[PDB]
Each structure stands twice: as C-alpha cells, then as structure tokens.
Nucleic acid binder design. Structure first.
Lengths: 142, 139
DNA sequence: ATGATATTATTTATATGATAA
DNA sequence: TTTATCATATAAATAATATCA
C-alpha cells in the first residue's frame, strides 16, 4: 500500500532537520529560527493569526515564542497608529546578522536540495503542492 | 521559492484534515499516528525505528506507549530471546479502533489525489524518494 | 594446560524524571 | 493543564582479556 502522506511528512521532517543542523552554531530552537524566518518575510501590520499559521504553531504558542524573542532583544511589539488592538511585529536592528545566517542556510539548503532534480520535476511538483493544498482546505470546508 | 515552507504547510493541513475526520474518536494526534504505524510495521522493528516512522524521538514514543498500554490498546511483552528487547503489537480491543484510523487515512489519501493526473502523482511519489535520499546524503 | 568463570568495556533496547516548549 | 524532550539511568547481550583450584 502507498503511505504517501506519511512519506511526505518524513521529507519535511528531514528538510527541517538539515536546516536545524546547519544552524547549530546560533543555538536557537527550531520554533525560534522558523519564527524569525517568517517575521522577516511577513509585513508587521499582519496579525498574529496570520503569522502563526505560516510558522505552524497555534496563536497562543506564537505569543510564548514572541515573548522569548523580545527578551533576547530580537523583535519589538509596538501598538500600531491606525489600529490600537493590533501590534506590529518588527525585527530589531541587532537581529540583522542573525537573520542573515538563518536566511542564507534556508536559501542555500533549498538550492542544494532542488539542485538535484529536473525542471519538469520541480515545476510539476511545485504546482501539485498548491493543488493538493487547495483541495484539502476545500475538503476541510465540507 | 518557498518550496520547503510549502511542503510543510501541505503536510500540516493534510494531517489536520485527518485529525478532524477522526475527532469523535477522541485520540490525540500523537496516539492515532502511533497506532497507525504500530499496525503498519512488523513488531520486530525497533523502538528507535518505530519512532522514525512516526516522526518522534524514543523518549516521546515511550510515554505514548505507556498511555496506549494504559488504555489496553497495545502490549509490550519482553522478548524471550532478548530480555532487553520488547514486542509492540495491538490488542484485540484495538481492532475496531485501528479499523477507524486506517479507514480515514486510506480514504483521505485516495480523495486528496483525486483531480490530479497519473504522471503528476508519479512525480510527487518519485520526488519524495529522490529528495529524501539526497537530504540523507547531506547532513 | 583445562574448564569454569570472572572481570571490565561496548553496544543495543528501553525506561524515567526535571522542566521547557 | 498536558506533553514532549534532554540527558541521563537500567539492563541485557557482546566481546575482549584475565584468573584459578
């Protein structure tokens, strides 16, 4: 029998693990580098719900992670001028060289991994990922 | 490209759809994945390797095993040949439980792959293999 | 020299217990 | 509040060398 879904979970596990290994010198947890990775790529005006989903933890879990990152001095959480229940999540000046380390491993690691496959594979695969995700979310609505 | 982030999102939404369809069963995500893998694999397979199939470390598998044993869903009889090795297998009372879990996993996989073509599935399958192997080469 | 074992280190299998996510 | 995790503990099988009535 196919165990395709499980095989896909394993692939993501080992991809993450490889990145986590390469980042071993920063001494950050995986939720930490994944959180910082996503804060950098996502606008500060965006809500915690939207940040939490991209990262893959729940909203309350994100609050705990953001607490840790603020104590470390890597982010600030300041109230927005246009909406007073919303807070902008911004990387601090001093995080800049850490973000460079995380982004570089992530990017290099992807290039190395996808460097071992055909354009057809990459394209067919990239499109399917979007399609299957699309289907599941619909099924979840049903 | 965010292909890693993309794959990770797919994985999580797919698991969450299975979890949702299994809700009335009131098993934690960790329990139902473990039950599924215990049923899939030979009992001779190690605890380190069972954890590998599941996606967890062995201390996390041990407490999960205690809980499942608590519920009388699994036994861990100590191997008569190797007094430090154990035999993990489902009980008879877990028979209708695994039938549920397996049922939902197979039906959901078969459903998710609907609408997509034969050579597209062949790529998803062939690339999990190649990329995992290539990631295993690194590290 | 013999068997009977004993002494120590290595590796493999599983388990626990403080905390940290 | 569970829940999982890190660095450990038992513990049995593995194996190399050593000791004696």
């Amino acid at each position: 029998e196919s165990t395709l879904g499980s095989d896909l979970a394993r692939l993501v596990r080992v991809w993450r693990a490889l990145i986590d290994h390469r980042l071993k010198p920063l001494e950050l947890t995986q939720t930490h580098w994944v959180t910082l990775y996503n804060i950098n790529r996502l606008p500060p005006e965006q809500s915690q719900i939207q940040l939490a989903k991209a990262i893959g933890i729940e909203q309350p879990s994100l609050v705990r992670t953001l607490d840790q990152l603020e104590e470390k001095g890597l982010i600030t959480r300041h109230t927005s001028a246009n909406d007073r229940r919303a807070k902008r999540i911004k990387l601090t000046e001093q995080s800049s060289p850490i973000i460079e380390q995380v982004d570089g491993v992530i990017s290099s690691t992807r290039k190395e991994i996808l460097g071992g496959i055909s354009s057809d594979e990459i394209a067919v695969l990239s499109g399917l990922i979007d399609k299957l995700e699309k289907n599941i979310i619909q099924l979840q609505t049903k």
